[PDB]
């Protein structure tokens, strides 16, 4: 029993986080193999290996070359990393959730899980100095990462990019008039973490009554909430048939949460509707899949 | 900016957990140098429950009923001691990633980071507290036995807690690394039951900072209290009482933001009044206590 936002085990990941150090910037560098991974901020970014200081727990690496790719810099180092694990570099959609391994000068001071908002942001608990965090998956025995921190936006919220140094969002790596869209709240999230709280006993929220998706669809316009999708639907199967109460039965309870409100009542202990718990997070922490 | 429930990286606890086979029960262990820290209900069968005698089972056993896993090799038991409600596996390799580390024992409020585990493979890591009634609200399936609490301040891991059950709420119960249990509970399959909880009232305050720091004060008002009287509101909610002690471990941040902490009283009175309206505090539509002044101070 219970209900946390669980992160993955980062250890695999602390072991490749560096510190890097252009002049007088310092951030934090992801070191794979003979490569240091980091935000080319560091540093028109077009216009010597040397200037690049490297270190690795209290050993200086040697920059051997250097090159860009997108908004990435990769520092070719002249060692191996003997502790890199097995990893791809992955590209996730909005509504998708990953740890972050959160760290300064090099070093990790902590671990969140967060999720990919639709307005391409995450919420994420970042200060000076964190930009070159990352943000990842497990998978078996492979690490997926799929976000780097680059930057915090007026509102308190941050922006990055993949691994290939493509932002998510239309954020740009500069001083400039930058913001983050309206956001929206993850339907398909919240509809699985309802599907977790029948899992752990709370059913309060149950009715007898069903929806069609189009009209669902008509309240969750409404209330700011993304549209749901057949995929959605099909992809909430296996919940649905744990509990025994279809899709369409749970969005008639979360249309009457939206229209109502919790009247004094709680759902995992929380007031507010929770959408940061994929489909596949609630799956797992609700069946113990172990790295 | 921002404010995330934020745990200790887990790759040093990562590199210590062990699966332990005793006949047909399977939980984890804690290996650290020559030894193998689990729980003691390993050499129980599900009937020994309801009134084992741990000392009787324990002497019927030898080294070799006691299976160690880690990773894919078999360490090799040669000795075992209890202490209290833990049992200590003496095997035959030292744990080479064995980091820095401490036994503490904390006390009600105090926050950690939990590892869980089942088969001695970590699945995930979350932040907890040490509930006032001694329980902690963690999220434990079967098999998760021996998943270990710890903080790392420094390059120290300081272990606090080692799981051994779930009461029937769906709350969970353990000990600390030298088998003594936290709470009133026993290793025992009987009612003992989890006390009325309360609100961790220093942590709610600590939180209030928080968002004070993060550039929010819609909840301040122009009023104080007493201690006196903000405790005697303070418990009709259901909040732990606020002694001296708290008022001192609040310093720092009443400098740090200028608000004295029996002004930060008198929001908390309010908003225990009021209620939010609508608004939140950090993302959060209820009052937060799973922070404490120095995770507060960590992380902001
Ligand atoms: C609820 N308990 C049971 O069904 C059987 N239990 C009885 C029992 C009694 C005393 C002691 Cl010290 C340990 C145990 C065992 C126990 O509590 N282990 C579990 C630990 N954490 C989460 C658990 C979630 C679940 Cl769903 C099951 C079992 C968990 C085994
Ligand atoms: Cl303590």
Not at 274 to 284: I, N
Request: with cysteine; net charge negative; proline share 4%.
């Amino acid at each position: 029993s219970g209900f946390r936002k669980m992160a993955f085990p980062s250890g695999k990941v602390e072991g490749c986080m560096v510190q890097v150090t252009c002049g007088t910037t310092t951030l934090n560098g992801l070191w794979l193999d003979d490569v240091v991974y980091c935000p080319r901020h560091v540093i028109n970014y077009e216009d010597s290996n040397h200037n690049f200081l490297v270190q690795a727990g209290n050993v200086q690496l040697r920059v051997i070359g250097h090159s860009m790719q997108n908004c990435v810099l990769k520092l070719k180092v002249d060692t191996a990393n003997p502790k890199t694990p097995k990893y791809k570099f992955v590209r996730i959609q909005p509504g998708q959730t990953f740890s972050v391994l959160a760290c300064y000068n090099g070093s990790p001071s902590g671990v969140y899980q967060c999720a990919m908002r639709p307005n391409f942001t995450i919420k994420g608990s970042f200060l000076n100095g964190s930009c070159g965090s990352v943000g990842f998956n497990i998978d078996y025995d492979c690490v997926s990462f799929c976000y780097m921190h680059h930057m915090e936006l007026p509102t308190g919220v941050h922006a990055g990019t993949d691994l290939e140094g493509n932002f998510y969002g239309p954020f740009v790596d500069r001083q400039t008039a930058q913001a983050a869209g309206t956001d929206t709240t993850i339907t398909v999230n919240v509809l699985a973490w309802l599907y977790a709280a029948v899992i752990n006993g709370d059913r309060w929220f149950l009715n007898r009554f069903t929806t069609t998706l189009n009209d669902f669809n008509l309240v969750a316009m409404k209330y700011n909430y993304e549209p749901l999708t057949q995929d959605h639907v099909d992809i909430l199967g296996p919940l649905s048939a744990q509990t025994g109460i279809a899709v369409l039965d749970m969005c008639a309870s979360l249309k009457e949460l939206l229209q109502n409100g919790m009247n004094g009542r709680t759902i995992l202990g929380s007031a507010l509707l929770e959408d940061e718990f994929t489909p596949f997070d609630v799956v797992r922490q609700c069946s113990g899949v172990t790295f």
